[PDB]
Each structure stands twice: as C-alpha cells, then as structure tokens.
C-alpha cells in the first residue's frame, strides 16, 4: 500500500514537514492515507 | 513515530435510528469525533456503509458542537443542498456519501467556513444526501458550494441539486427549492 515517505504534498499544504500549511486535502490524498 | 494529518475542523459522526418511542432529537446517536485523516478512516472503515444501515436511519457528519438539526444556532439561518438519488446501486450510493465526507473533512470548498455538515437519509422510496450550510441568504457561498459539489461529485444528468432553506422545510412537515444546479 501507499508509503508515508512518498505521500506527495502540494505547495502550501500541511505536511509533517510543514505544520503551517493549509489543512486541506484532495480526495485522492485522503484515499491515499486510508492505509496505515 | 507515525504523525497523523490534522483536519481543519473537528467533525462528529451522528447516526439516527428511527424509533417512534423517542423524540426525533433522541433518535440521534453521537458516535465519535475525529480531527485527523487517520482517525476519520479508523471510524469509517469499521462502520456500515449507507447501503447497509436500517431503512429510516441517517448518517450525519457535522463540525463539532454543531448538532445535525434545524434548531442548532449554526443551522437556524442555513439551508441544505439536497441530492435526491434515483435508486442507484449500493456502491454508487456509498461512493457518493464517502466522496461527500471527503469534501467536508478535506475542506474542498472556498466557503468551507459556511459548511455545517452533511446528512444521508436511507429510506425505502429513495435515498437522499444533503450538505447543510450556515447562511441561506449567502447566495455567493450557496452557489459556490453547489457548483463545487456537482464538480467534485460525478456530474449526473439524472440527479440534480436542490437548495432548500431550513426555515422553509422546518415549517412544511411539498418543499420549495430556492436554487437548482
Ligand atoms: C431534519 N429533521 C427531521 N426532523 C423530523 O423528521 C421529519 C423529516 O424526516 P427526514 O428529514 O429525516 O427524512 P424523510 O425522508 O422521512 O423526510 P420527508 O421526505 O419529508 O418524509 C420531520 O417531519 C420531523 O418530524 C426534525 N425534527 C426536528 N425537530 N429537527 C430537525 O432538524 C429535524
């Protein structure tokens, strides 16, 4: 399944390396995180 | 070690089970609240999809502290984008509801601050999915959410959008539509 290290984050989006980014997630992004 | 992805809002899942021995409010059951993508999935993954819950039941996902009812102050001056479904399959039903939930928790709307929650009604004749917004008089926000809904959701020649003010549907227990997309 999808690997946390390869999750793509848009510019300005929240990420574990960008706590200030917007907490907005696309549909495909949310489905991507459905697997631990 | 695993860092969860926080959502812009805290959301609460409600499940209504028809029970005439109780008032409608008391039919609402607060399940759990979540504020991360992972915790949403931990909830959704292990609850029945809409196609499997009892007839007469609802699922409602609303921002924390907003009850899924007209009386709540966040919904008094609001309305809902109603999506009457034309007897689609179970997967189409469930995928539509999930996509709605992902629109909500993912903050897909420009006027996401106007979003209060969403309700799916599982009924015998036809099922119904509604997105509740805060201010029905806010035409700019109602249309943006409406346009964004038919865009993020698969355009359906068969199913249309109907925006109904809560002030109206509350009186008529038959109900006028103030927008149509
Ligand atoms: C959303 N809602 C529904 N009800 C009750 O539930 C009824 C509507 O029920 P419903 O909106 O849950 O679905 P239904 O498909 O049966 O609606 P219908 O097509 O009009 O038949 C109302 O007549 C009320 O008795 C509500 N009653 C209160 N007090 N507050 C609410 O916000 C509310």
Compute the residue count for chain B: 181
Residue B34, H or E segment: strand B28-36
Instruction: Give how far A14 is from chain B: nearest CA, Å.
Output: 8
Query: Touching check for B2 and chain A: CB below 8 Å?
Result: yes
Burial profile B155-171: b = 16 or more Cβ within 10 angstroms, e = fewer: eeeebebbbbbbeebee
Residue linked to tokens 């915790």: B39
SS (H, E, C) chain B: CCCCCEEEEEEEEEEECCCCCCCHHHHEEEEEEEEEHHHHHHHHCCCCCHHHCCCCCEEEEEECCCCCCCCCHHHHCCEEEEEECCCCCHHHHHHHHHHHHHHHHCCCCCCHHHEEEEEEECCCCCCEEEEEECCCCCHHHHHHHHHHHHHHCCCCCCCCCEEEEHHHHCCCCCCCCCEEC
Q: And the tokens for B150? A: 């038919």
Q: And the tokens for B139? A: 């035409």
The DSSP bridge partners found for residue B36 are: B6
Burial profile B82-119: b = 16 or more Cβ within 10 angstroms, e = fewer: bbebeebeeeebbbbbbbbbbbbbbbbbebbebbbbbb
Distance of CA B9 to the CA centre of its chain: 15
Residues B146/B163, Cβ–Cβ less than 8 Å: yes
Burial profile B35-67: b = 16 or more Cβ within 10 angstroms, e = fewer: bbbbbbbebbeeeebbbebeeebbbbbbbeebb
Lining residues, ligand 1, CB within 6 Å:
B 24, 58, 69-71, 121, 123, 128, 173
Q: And the tokens for B39? A: 């915790």
Of B59, B65, B49, the C-alpha closest to B15 is B59
DSSP type of residue B96:
H
Instruction: Give how far B2 is from chain A: nearest CA, Å.
Output: 9
E-strand ranges in B37-105 read: 58-63, 79-84
Q: And the tokens for B82? A: 């109603």
Resolution in A: 2.2
The DSSP bridge partners found for residue B14 are: B30, B60
Angle made by CA atoms B100, B76, B82, in degrees to the nearest 5: 35
CATH number of B1-181: 3.30.760.10
B107 → closest Cβ in A4, A24, A33:
A24
Could you write out the DSSP letters of every residue in A1-36? ---GGG----TTB-BTTBTTSB----HHHHHHTT--
Query: Touching check for A3 and chain B: CB below 8 Å?
Result: no
For residue B169, give the ligand 1 atom closest to its CA: 20
């Amino acid at each position: 399944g999808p690997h946390m290290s390869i999750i793509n984050y848009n510019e300005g989006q929240w990420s574990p390396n960008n706590p200030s980014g917007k907490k907005q997630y696309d549909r495909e992004q949310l489905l991507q995180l459905r697997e631990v | 070690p695993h860092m969860k992805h926080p959502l812009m809002n805290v959301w609460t899942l409600w499940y209504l089970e028809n029970d005439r021995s109780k008032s409608w409010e008391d039919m609402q059951n607060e399940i759990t609240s979540f504020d991360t993508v992972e915790d949403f999935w931990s909830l959704y993954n292990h609850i029945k999809p809409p196609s499997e819950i009892k007839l007469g039941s609802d699922y409602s996902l609303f921002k924390k502290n907003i009850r899924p009812m007209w009386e709540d102050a966040a919904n008094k001056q609001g309305g809902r984008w109603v999506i009457t479904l034309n007897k689609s399959s179970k997967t189409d039903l469930d995928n539509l509801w999930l996509d709605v939930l992902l629109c909500l928790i993912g903050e897909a709307f420009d006027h996401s601050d106007q979003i209060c929650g969403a309700v799916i009604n599982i009924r015998g004749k036809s099922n119904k999915i509604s997105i509740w917004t805060a201010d029905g008089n806010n035409e700019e926000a109602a249309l943006e959410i409406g346009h964004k809904l038919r865009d993020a959701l698969r355009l359906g020649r068969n199913n249309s959008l109907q925006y109904q003010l809560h002030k109206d549907t509350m009186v008529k227990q038959n109900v006028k539509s103030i927008y149509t997309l």
